[PDB]
Amino acid sequence: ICGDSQECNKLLLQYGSFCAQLNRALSGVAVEQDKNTEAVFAQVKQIYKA
Amino acid sequence: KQNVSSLMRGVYYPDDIYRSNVNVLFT
Amino acid sequence: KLTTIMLSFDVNGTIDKAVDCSSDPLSELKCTLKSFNVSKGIYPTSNFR
Ligand SMILES: *[C@@H]1O[C@H](CO)[C@@H](O)[C@H](O)[C@H]1NC(C)=O
Ligand SMILES: *[C@@H]1O[C@H](CO)[C@@H](O)[C@H](O)[C@H]1NC(C)=O
């Protein structure tokens, strides 16, 4: 939102919880798809050789 | 005439208004 | 000097503890996540430094 602006950041300091929601939701989605990629592939633990 | 360290000894009340049970940011 | 800080308060209106997120990466994490207790993990941080 703010291009390293002091006044813009000073006004966003009244919307801290909004960006806390956004960062937490996107981090949870990223961790969720790391879990998805782990669950679809990593089912067997012993990596058998060719 | 030497230096010491500000070991968290500069915290004051920024605004005159009353607040409780909150964590708020300041500039 | 001009600094961004994070201040907590109790039920009595007294200041419990301060962060001063211009000195430490953990302080910047505490100002970013809007909390004083942070769970274990990796978190992107803002530009308070
Ligand atoms: C404080 O330390 C700096 C370097 O660490 C030094 O240049 C300065 O003279 C010191 N301050 C005083 C009042 O001696
Ligand atoms: C607030 O003050 C009362 C004294 O009347 C004390 O018993 C209580 O522990 C204080 N609360 C905090 C959070 O320090």
Side-chain angles (χ1 to χ4, degrees):
Chain A
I1 301 167
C2 312
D4 278 351
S5 294
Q6 190 80 87
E7 298 96 352
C8 185
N9 280 297
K10 152 172 59 54
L11 292 184
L12 177 70
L13 258 66
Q14 88 200 2
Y15 302 107
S17 304
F18 202 96
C19 203
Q21 203 162 7
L22 300 184
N23 284 325
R24 179 191 324 128
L26 278 170
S27 289
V29 163
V31 161
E32 171 200 278
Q33 304 166 87
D34 287 314
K35 189 198 295 312
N36 290 354
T37 306
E38 174 169 338
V40 63
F41 279 110
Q43 292 180 356
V44 288
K45 294 73 151 163
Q46 306 272 54
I47 306 301
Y48 300 102
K49 285 193 271 192
Chain B
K1 307 175 171 59
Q2 58 268 64
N3 300 325
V4 296
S5 198
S6 302
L7 280 169
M8 330 185 274
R9 298 310 297 238
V11 186
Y12 71 102
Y13 284 77
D15 44 354
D16 291 331
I17 57 173
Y18 186 80
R19 277 146 144 171
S20 48
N21 271 354
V22 296
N23 322 313
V24 288
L25 276 296
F26 296 103
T27 56
Chain C
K1 66 197 69 166
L2 207 62
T3 315
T4 181
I5 49 168
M6 183 177 177
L7 289 192
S8 187
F9 302 96
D10 272 338
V11 293
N12 295 359
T14 61
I15 298 173
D16 210 305
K17 43 187 89 167
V19 165
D20 184 65
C21 46
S22 293
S23 307
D24 202 72
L26 193 58
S27 302
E28 182 175 294
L29 168 68
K30 283 162 175 181
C31 287
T32 298
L33 271 190
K34 288 277 300 303
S35 175
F36 279 79
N37 296 344
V38 176
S39 309
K40 174 248 288 182
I42 182 169
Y43 310 95
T45 51
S46 290
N47 206 356
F48 294 117
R49 38 170 190 277

